[PDB]
């Protein structure tokens, strides 16, 4: 099968040029087409016929093609350009219509300030205990960078079973957020004095506690 | 017929900067505009055809923007070997017409010149001519002053200068200054000196030799 | 079925049909553009107009045609030949000699209003525009 | 104003059939060809099929030949993708796209897409628990309340507050994939502490795969 | 693999006829749908299109020049020529041949810009006669040494017309070479100099020869350059 090869990842600094390549045996004779897809949205054509821009695409985008390789260049890259970029090529005589593997463009915001997380810890609800179950909700939001670790404690001892924690995800204001859940039995929730949610970020700990006697 | 108005005429930008050259057609040329890069002494090289499409083997940093009569050429990040004169040409209809061109210089940090001086050869002195050469090597910017003093007499009107193309690697210039005298006048004075003034030299330099 | 008032962009022996205008697209490079213009100016037409493309025909000529685009770069408005000429009885033909597609149509009678239309032949990275103009001879 | 809307997605079992539709508006749909492109989780874009403007020609990727079929109704400006003998690897978001011209060359305009989930795992509805506010975890004078969505499969789950009338301060967190195989998430909203005894905050939850709609009221402790 | 090459005299007297010929290798003119044109560039000025010709022999001219202009084609030798009658000093330029397309108003036409060019030949229109150059060494001395590296060169004086080409050690030495543009001296003769920086330890051991060519006078000089005594 005819395929188009792309590098899986490319990362650059803002203001610099990002080059994304796409190799293919028939590209010397067939045009390449470049598509941008931001997370959660529909794809958009950014370059057609190797080097042309559709109406509405900024001049920062540009394409070239020499030999068996097409290149998509994004000058003056910004955070708004974080997306996946796919090349495409087709031939009616050969009966193929193929996308490349895709390339995820990462923008490293150079020299970035910091922000401490704000933790919100919810005790089990009055209705959940009536179902013979108990779940502690620990919400971690508004922190940068997005690389934290969460730990739970039973009065004084860590918990090594029944813990589920999310991966960090960027919010709308370019900060990170995550959450962690603790599954416990109603008897384990009343037998201990207090449960805590320990959140570590850059060596600084933010930790909150709720009591079962409420 | 169709007048191509290119601007700017000159352009100076450091390595890695974004450079845009524009071109405007008298009337509508559709999209039949091309961009040429001409190194000194060579024919122009075709870079872009039908306004937007890139010639094969051309680096990805070149791009084009087409319209009815307004056109653009852009370089995303300059390289040292990019210095040339760029022309736009319409191939829409006869007669073919070009723009005035854009001479692109790559800007760099200041570098003081290396000053050498060459006395006239004995073979040249056998005939009735004498040439003294003052050499400035690998400097930036191009603007420099060279004056000839012989026996502390400021000479004027017997020297010519020649300056090289910008170096493809270090973006520097080199300059020659040829003081021309007859053998008769050359054998009347002892000390020959050129004094060089440049932005890279905190105070002017003077290189000199004694006749013989 | 001999004379085709059109453009032959192919190269091999066109034994079946003979075209009035010929330009082999394989002889030009990617920096070139083929422009082929056909003009028809007679009181009553009985002409067989067509095209010989060694690549891809855009749009579905001649049932579909591009509205001519002066200036700009390439056409973008797809119209239908029955509405562009405003005649209700047009024959449409198609044949293929190897990898060369041939698309024809037959006009009979007079044309109400002078019109024109464009068809694109794209082979690899090269494009060839066939522009036809049919006069009303009013 | 080229507008394309896909519909017909859902959660099906492997082997099931399913027909997607794509409603087109803003352009002469009768004249352009149409593509179907899919995006599977973890993978990249994959071209599926395309059809001409009059249905003269159809093309299919070898990964779906013999199972998927494409059709169109020009009189209603609708494109159809008929999937059959569905397999687990067919789980993806399916976009319809307008071709550059009449045939199958390249896609230009895309719709928002519809999600198709093929799995032999049973669909489970969510559990909704109110996260009541109180004097605990004071956020600097205000209060933080929410609701918990627990043990649901598969995604997604949509959460709103006061039927869309309340939006300032609402934060819905991304879900977590538990060790059991089910998802869970929380949605917290911050409001002034003086409005606890006057305003009513209703947590709206909807899960389309299990047809469950639960609106739990969060009262102060 | 297409290659164009101009040929012709580089010095023509005023009011005479300037002749040039382009030779096409790697392709056939009679099979080509392209046009074959001539473009000139005066020293320090811009580009000017003269005219083109098809394998018919059909010619097209820049209107302000049709009276002095004549372009012909010889398909049996893959050549097309240029005739410029009644030349003046304004005709001193570098002349190029090139393959390009036709004009929009044509029925069946290739629209394409000049892609394949010739190397270009300078033609000086002057009443002056040819004079060969004199090559004098720019010997390296204590005054031309800096940082363990020395600089030497050759002085090419009193020649007409342009150009001259200079190489070092028969082309084997190109690193750190500066051939200056020629200047027009007070006598109406051109003069330039080529210089090169070499390591100081290699002086007296490595031989340095500048190769000067001035074809209008059939001049070839291989001047060895060595320190002064
Ligand atoms: C070449 O053909 C004839 C001469 O045989 C001429 O009238 C025609 O205009 C030419 N076609 C071109 C230059 O395209």
Author numbering:
A (entry chain B): 1 to 9, 11 to 95, 95A, 95B, 96 to 213
B (entry chain E): 1 to 212
C (entry chain R): 292 to 429
D (entry chain A): 1 to 52, 52A, 53 to 82, 82A, 82B, 82C, 83 to 100, 100A, ...
E (entry chain F): 1 to 35, 35A, 35B, 36 to 82, 82A, 82B, 82C, 83 to 100, ...
Paper text:
The parasite surface protein Pfs48/45 is a leading TBV candidate. Parasites that lack Pfs48/45 fail to generate oocysts, and rodent malaria parasites without P48/45 produce infertile male gametes, strongly suggesting that Pfs48/45 plays a key role in gamete fertilization. The most potent transmission-blocking mAb described to date is 85RF45.1,10 which targets the conserved epitope I on Pfs48/45 domain 3 (D3, also known as Pfs48/45-6C) and blocks the transmission of genetically diverse Plasmodium falciparum (P. falciparum) strains. Co-crystal structures of D3 in complex with four different mAbs delineated two conserved protective epitopes.
Structures of Pfs48/45-D3-Fab complexes were solved using X-ray crystallography to delineate the epitopes of four antibodies (RUPA-44, RUPA-117, RUPA-47, and RUPA-29). RUPA-29 binds primarily to β strands d and d′ (residues 347–356), β strand d″ (residues 368–371), and the intervening loop between β strands g and h (residues 413–416) of D3. The light-chain forms four H-bonds with D3 mediated by antibody residues K30, Y34, Y49, and S66, and two salt bridges mediated by residues D50 and D51. RUPA-29 and TB31F share the bulk of their key contacts on D3 and their variable domains are positioned similarly with regard to D3. Kinetics experiments of Fabs RUPA-47 and RUPA-29 binding to a D3 construct containing the K416N mutation showed that RUPA-47’s binding affinity remains unchanged, whereas RUPA-29’s binding affinity drops with the introduction of this rare polymorphism but remains in the nanomolar affinity range (109 nM). HCDR3 residues R94, M100A, K100B, V100D, and I100F form H-bonds and salt bridges with D3 residues D320, D312, H324, S326, and N328.
